Design a protein around this ligand. Structure first.
Ligand code: SRM
Ligand code: SRM
Ligand code: SRM
Ligand code: SF4
Lengths: 104, 385, 436, 436, 385, 104
């Protein structure tokens, strides 16, 4: 499915994930935030998004939850305070990473 | 037509109850269970499908067990409740093998309930609640999602289980086996249940490497996860020049798979949507036997490969039905009292299991996975001709 | 009906309850809608399920797209999202997610509770279930994304029930029916299962682990919930004192007045009960013998395999000094091979609030959460870093019971502090004594 | 005494033959030299061996330099060179090479031959030996490089005897004593050993292989040369027809007239022989029973373990239809783990010129010589490329006897030719039926 | 003093006899053996150290077995011949365990020969030819080179064996064991004999990583062989700046070893002279038990680790002598007739073996080597307290 | 030990192997041939010598015997005719390679 948000357009799956990471834009996070229960993207949300993106750019994977915590200093409970769906469905989606896979 | 439950999508974290867990079982016990819990003294099987327990107080409870298809409609649950309301004061349970159990206070009530249960039929003639599953017979088959719900099956759980239980049906309501036979089923080698540890096990198997969707792989997959997904190291990261289905030539990150090195486990697909492998004629069944979880006499055992391949034959899988029966019949005729299928097989020797069950033997049965493989070969001249 | 199902129709006959017959019935009850239920997902959901399944039977491959990430706010698992791969042909299963619902321990139900859950699912889902999922959950099979929160709201508010687990988390713990209806239960398996489930609600709802982790609770070594093969941490009851023998009941078995094994074998002629053949000669440690018509057991040499008890429930009982063993690392083949639980704690007392057991659970997690690689099961971490590490992690010292047998390969690591003089060695010291 | 030996001196007392007393005796004989031998290496060689060994007892480390490459022209192995690492302190063992001399099968000698060998070694070596090396060689312990060719020249010309093997070659084959002096030898083990040694002289004298290879020949499953643990190719006798039973002899055992096991246990009181307890109840397949005072055996179910024959040698005999089984892969731990032989050929007839046995040997070598990595034993190659490959290489098909048990992990390889449609699949064909 | 044999160093390949192999055993058989070969009917042990065989012809042969040190002077061999010339017509044999056997024609001759052999003494009191090694006793110890000749040992073969056989001596000439006990010895884990498969086994062990001679390593070693020598990937290639013995500063190709990854097998030293590891206080002994090669009743077994370290204590190794005797005594007192040590250990359970033999248990006994380690652990609740 | 041959100096061990490969000279082989039963170095000898040096220079090991045969075209029997002590003690010694190790 193609969608339009603020004159930019993105290709998305049934789950709301960005199909193509190179198709990313600064408007992506703002398109998503509503469906992930977020009023505004604060600085704390952004440190997490930036980290997820850098980590994916460098390593070709999402980081383990343990690594995300130790790298950004947000404990799991705080990640859920920021992203109510958690690090996968919330943060990773908002960051423009590929959908998490495995026995989810 | 949409009807709101009271949830507010505009305020999703308000009025949210969470972290409350399951109900406590004591919410649901029959009065006789609640009274005597912890004080049970002994049990006996009164007859196929009917159990009795004696408590220290003198109290007796009679349990009547009947089959369940596991997959069931709400209408079937409501029918189960109807039965429970009429006969059981509104109480019932399900077993770890997905049979249904109804409890009453006297043998005569249990006998009347067995007779009522056995009389119930679906349109087509199948028993709704066939009574049995107790003692030394053949009980329900623990199984998985198959083509009803899962994306990684190589076969169908619900269908294969139906075929096999029709085939063996007469042993459910009877106790003629050397020991209760546990048959299990999984539709891929994730083995979501008890395949690795059952008397006889049915396992969906693939026989062809993944078909790589190069155009989408890097966009939909974390490549190193797919690479690390392989137990035998057949996958490596690579670049590749492709023509997209739009006609554009471009070079992508992707993987390459050495075909002669892949053994079709499917795990790279679990990790990566662009690596599907299912195939009509390639996919089928492996049969395994001789595993168990109890510690009775012998230690818990893994089940072993005993049929390399039975093809999928939806909807009736006759070759499957025929093979299980054949295994069961050889076991019931030969094994000693209390011997599970693995007890029997190991005592007479696998060389005799294969002959007795009239199964072929091939390359496929011989372990070749890492250093442990060696221990499964025969380091002794103790063999039978 | 909506779709021709010529292949699936073959599964309507034969004696075993037909999943096809049942789903056809449910499809029909939806079409009729006798109770005027305002269905929240497509009416024809079950007709489209049969349609797509039939297509699978026809072409021999699954028709579910890969994966799916759906859920409810606050939780990082509980729902398995699924989307059919032919949504135009089968719009009724376009969304077809499964909701995992926390079950009571031992799966006892009142019709009150089940009927209420059926009302709920009838309206907000497909009207299809699994009773139960292999891990233990009540499984509700098929609903749409927008209904996930609605169902969850009613489940929690009206039913006081929670979701079960999925993902890299603590999964739903299960138990055998324990002492509710069994004379062998060595501890209140249902209660421990309940209490652990409540204690670790956070680890269940919000995946925090390198991979999945499972608990299962067996009341005795018969393993009626199969914890030794199907849980990362397996809790299996025993006793450590003597088997209790009622000699009068022994004589009654010997005399043909009580069927062996509760009559489990009554469908076949195996001859009259023979205690020598069926009990004494089968005990794996050969620790039983008959003396003057009385059964004697050398308990020191009993491994508690259950066999004599299983044969003579009316004459032999578990001991009075009860507890459980904990075994670690069971898992299915992927990646490094099937494992069953390996003995870690041979015997621990079971006593609310279960601090000692919590100490083991948390010792293991602390280790595994730190050291575990992505998607490495505990059992694989144990193979990678060794059993000795697991034993240390829970504050134990190695005992012979920790192994079936000692290693035969002599590739034995030593810690430097245990070796006199340590490892700081200069080649010049060596060359003073040994010419090149 | 050239050197003080106060540590070694402690091993002169105690009942077991003292290697110290003996070596001291030999050093004295060389010093006295009462037969006027023109000693070719230092006279005090044994003194210096005692001195350097005493140094080792003192400092707890070996005093031989690493390695040594010496030999005779035409041969790539046969001699293990060695140099002491303190040649100034112990000039007599500055060169201290071991010569491996080929032994008769079953290690039968005449004094004629041994005296000849002694005269030779007295003169040209140290006058110290090992009888025998673990592989089976006559070991002559200690000589100098210039003397290697002189000794070889006398050994071949005056004695008609060859060197044995060392290096990456066929090593010296050994047998049990076979039918020379045992009622259970199922084939002439000494003969097959000799004949195989002769057939492959080139592969033993001139290292051609990826690594070492050994043959050992046991006449029955008792394994008196231990081929199953100490040869890459192990050959073990059996029979495939019935055990021959002398019932009168059975009745004599039962009646106390013959001691069980040929009197092996006569030093302890184990009670009177009880055939039921000592034979019938111990048979691993439970295939024996007594009926009206006569022993019966269900031979189909006999795995030929030898027990009953060993207990009752005067009543039970091997069958008439004899051959051997061939097992492959045994080796010490380095690199990948210790192995014993794994059954490859369940039964093969033994018949000069043994073409069929030579086909197995050469098929295995042809495979291993191409595919084996540097310093990879056959056992390791079997683990690397799999047992099925070994079965293929000797032209057999897999049979259940090839395993103790079928595999449990389901990581199963298929050859493409065996799978309908093969492996050449297009993603477009798949996408036709399954939407992304 | 150099005396030529006839060999000519300037014409080395002239008159070179080669490829002639061993002698045929029939060159050496006693006449009774030559005549009855292949026709043997049965045997008996007449008394410790004396066997009899009956042939189909009715002929009998009496074999008298005595101990041997394996390591042996020519003067000792010449004395063995003297014995054989006087009593056995100049014939004799050695066994696969390196005992010595003399064959005669009657029981009376055999008894006289035993009495003679038992009378022979070295200076210092040791028996030259102690009689026994038959039936259910303790026989000779198969062993290796140790400090007499090998460069990879961690202990001495001839010494440790002398110590253990003194300690157990009285059991050699008697038959009071539940079955014959095979004790073996190897001085490093190459195991150049039977350690991996004996009832009790003594094994030379290191506990310190190699000391790297960097100045010489590339000059004396094929570096990639040393890297590949390591079963655990502790060795890797590297360059390194060093100061040579002469005080010159250069950079060499060498290896680096991660100490925490090394388990002291010594195999890199076998491949590479610059990686020695022997150490006086680090080196010692491991004890193993429960192995066997026969197929009698049970299948061949590997021996298992039962003592992690006994220090080297040359010349008398008292702690070794003590530990072996202690194992042998518990086994002889508890095991059932015909049970090998391993049969015994496995039946009572290793948890009971450690308690009956009063042995400590640690970290060190628990397999941690690759995927097969898993199988050695306890996947059952069947254990004893 | 240090030795002198036609005004050239080589360091050698007890077995006559060259200690330092960098110390190789075209004189080394000529010094060795007598101890190794070779009258004169033929073209065939030289091809084998050259291959061994080249293989050690490239790979840091001596070649396996099957690699040496197949790469030079000399069967094992012919190597022994050329080098009566075999490819290890004869050829590798003459080429200036390190002593073979392991259980020789
Ligand atoms: C993934 C998926 N599973 Fe599942 N699974 C259920 C239960 C099990 C059990 C038995 C148990 O819990 O008692 C096992 C074996 C024991 C173990 O935990 O290893 C099991 C295995 C796996 C694996 C292998 C994990 C490994 O090798 O270590 C995977 C792959 C992976 O983790 O990447 C895997 N499972 N599973 C049961 C849960 C229901 C409940 O809540 O009680 C099932 C629904 C089976 C049933 O029919 O009862 C189930 C199924 C699944 C797949 C989802 C199926 C769906 O469409 O709903 C899933 C999630 C595959 C996926 O979506 O990737
Ligand atoms: C190297 C060295 N060996 Fe030796 N070895 C003798 C015999 C054996 C046996 C038993 C047998 O042949 O019956 C084994 C175990 C079976 C097997 O072949 O694996 C054995 C092992 C080893 C290994 C391990 C090989 C592996 O793990 O795959 C090595 C290391 C390697 O090959 O790199 C090794 N051995 N060995 C026996 C032969 C005498 C004969 O009959 O001709 C011994 C002399 C022992 C004895 O005292 O009887 C012997 C010894 C040796 C080492 C030194 C010999 C010396 O005279 O000093 C030697 C050559 C180590 C070396 O110099 O590099
Ligand atoms: C002489 C010798 C053969 C040879 O030199 O070629 C030999 C000779 C006999 N063996 Fe043995 N075996 C000999 C090495 C072995 C070995 C090799 C080893 O120990 O390294 C084994 C395997 C050990 C193991 O099982 O791990 C061996 C396992 C047996 C067995 C089965 C083992 C058991 O005790 O259960 C028997 C059967 C029996 O003794 O009842 C046996 C029986 C026999 C018989 C009775 C065979 C016969 O009928 O003539 C011989 C007399 C036994 C006795 O003295 O009690 N022989 N035999 C070897 C004597 C060694 C010594 O000096 O003590
Ligand atoms: S596991 Fe034991 S306690 Fe639980 S139901 Fe089974 S027999 Fe009873």
């Amino acid at each position: 499915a193609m969608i339009e948000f603020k004159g930019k357009s993105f290709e998305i799956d049934e789950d709301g994930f960005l199909l193509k990471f190179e198709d990313w834009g600064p408007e992506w996070a703002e398109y998503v935030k509503e469906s992930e229960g977020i009023s505004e993207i604060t600085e704390a949300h952004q440190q997490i998004l930036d980290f997820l993106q850098d980590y994916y750019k460098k390593n070709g994977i999402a980081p383990m939850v343990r690594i995300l915590s130790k790298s950004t200093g947000y404990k799991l409970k705080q990640i859920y305070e920021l992203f109510p769906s958690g690090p996968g469905k919330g943060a990773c989606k908002m960051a423009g990473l590929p959908k998490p896979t495995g026995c989810v | 037509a949409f009807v709101s439950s009271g949830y507010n999508p505009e305020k999703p974290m308000e009025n949210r109850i969470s972290d409350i867990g399951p109900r406590h079982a004591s919410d649901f016990f029959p009065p006789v269970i609640a009274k005597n819990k912890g004080q049970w003294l002994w049990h006996e099987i009164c007859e196929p499908g009917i159990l009795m327990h004696k408590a220290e107080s003198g109290d007796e409870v009679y349990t009547v067990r009947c089959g369940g298809a596991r997959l069931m409609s709400v209408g079937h649950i409501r029918e189960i409740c109807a039965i429970a309301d009429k006969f059981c004061g509104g109480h019932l349970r399900f077993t770890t093998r997905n049979n249904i159990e109804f409890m009453v206070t006297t043998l005569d009530e249990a006998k009347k309930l067995k007779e009522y249960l056995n009389a119930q039929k679906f349109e087509g003639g199948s028993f709704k609640f066939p009574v049995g599953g107790t003692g030394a017979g053949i009980t329900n088959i623990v199984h998985t999602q198959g083509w009803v719900h899962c994306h990684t099956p190589a076969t169908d759980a619900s269908g294969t289980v139906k075929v096999v239980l029709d085939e063996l049906f007469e042993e459910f309501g009877q106790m003629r086996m050397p020991a209760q036979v546990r048959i299990s089923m999984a539709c891929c080698l994730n083995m979501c249940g008890a395949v690795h540890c059952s008397d006889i096990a049915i396992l969906g198997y693939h026989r062809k490497p993944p078909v790589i969707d190069h155009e989408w792989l890097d966009n939909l997959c974390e490549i190193p996860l797919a690479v690390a997904a392989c137990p035998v190291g057949a996958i490596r990261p690579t670049k590749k020049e492709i023509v997209t289905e739009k006609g554009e030539t471009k070079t992508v990150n992707t993987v390459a798979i050495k075909n002669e090195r892949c053994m079709f486990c499917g795990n790279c697909y679990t990790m990566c949507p662009s690596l599907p492998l299912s195939d009509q004629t390639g996919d089928g069944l492996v049969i395994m036997a001789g595993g168990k979880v109890s510690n009775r006499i012998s230690n818990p055992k893994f089940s072993k490969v005993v049929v390399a391949f039975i093809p999928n034959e939806p909807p009736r899988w006759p070759r499957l039905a025929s093979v299980i029966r054949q295994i069961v019949e050889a076991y019931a005729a030969d094994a000693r009292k209390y011997e599970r299928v693995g007890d029997w097989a190991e005592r007479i020797g696998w060389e005799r299991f294969f002959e007795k069950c009239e199964l072929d033997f091939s390359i496929h049965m011989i372990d070749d996975f890492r250093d442990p493989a060696y221990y499964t070969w025969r380091q002794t001249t103790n063999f039978k001709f | 009906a909506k779709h021709a199902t010529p292949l699936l129709d073959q599964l309507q006959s034969g004696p075993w309850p037909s999943f096809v017959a049942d789903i056809k019935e449910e499809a029909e009850r939806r079409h009729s809608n006798q109770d005027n239920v305002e269905y929240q997902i497509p009416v024809d959901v079950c007709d489209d399920l049969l349609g797509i399944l039939e297509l699978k039977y026809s072409d021999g491959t699954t028709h579910w797209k890969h994966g799916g990430i759906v859920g409810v706010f606050g939780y990082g698992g509980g729902v398995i999202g699924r989307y059919c791969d032919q949504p135009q042909m089968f719009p009724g299963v376009a969304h077809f997610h499964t909701v995992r619902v926390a079950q009571p321990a031992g799966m006892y139900y009142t019709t009150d509770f089940l009927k209420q859950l059926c009302d709920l699912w009838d309206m907000r889902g497909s009207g299809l279930t699994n009773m139960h999922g292999a891990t233990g959950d009540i499984v509700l099979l098929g609903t749409t994304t927008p209904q996930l929160e609605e169902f969850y709201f009613e489940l929690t508010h009206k039913m006081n029930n929670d979701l079960g687990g999925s993902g890299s988390n603590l999964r739903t713990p299960a138990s055998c029916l324990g002492d509710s209806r069994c004379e062998w239960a060595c501890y209140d398996a249902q209660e421990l299962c309940y209490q652990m489930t409540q204690e670790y609600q956070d680890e269940l709802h919000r995946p925090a682990f390198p991979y999945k982790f499972k608990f299962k609770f067996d009341g005795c070594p018969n393993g009626c919930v199969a914890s030794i093969a199907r849980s990362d941490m397996s809790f299996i009851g025993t006793w450590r004192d003597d088997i209790r023998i009622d000699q009068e009941a022994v004589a009654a078995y010997v005399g043909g007045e009580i069927q062996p094994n509760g009559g489990a074998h009554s469908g076949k002629d195996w001859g009259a009960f023979d205690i020598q053949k069926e009990v004494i000669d089968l005990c794996p440690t050969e620790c039983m013998w008959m003396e003057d018509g009385k059964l004697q057991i050398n308990n020191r040499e009993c491994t508690r395999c259950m066999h004599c008890l299983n044969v003579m429930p009316r004459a032999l009982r578990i001991g009075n000094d009860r507890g459980l063993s904990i075994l670690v690392g069971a898992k299915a083949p992927i990646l490094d091979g099937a494992q069953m639980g390996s003995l870690l704690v041979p015997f621990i007392k079971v006593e609310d609030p279960y601090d000692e057991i919590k100490e083991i659970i948390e010792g293991i997690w602390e280790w595994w959460m730190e050291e575990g690689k992505n998607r490495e099961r505990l059992g694989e971490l144990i193979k990678r870093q060794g059993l000795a590490k697991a034993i240390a992690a829970v504050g134990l010292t190695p005992v012979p019971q920790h192994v079936m047998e000692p290693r035969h390969n002599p590739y034995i690591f030593w810690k430097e502090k245990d070796v006199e003089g340590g490892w700081d060695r200069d080649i010049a010291d060596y060359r003073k004594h040994h010419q090149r």
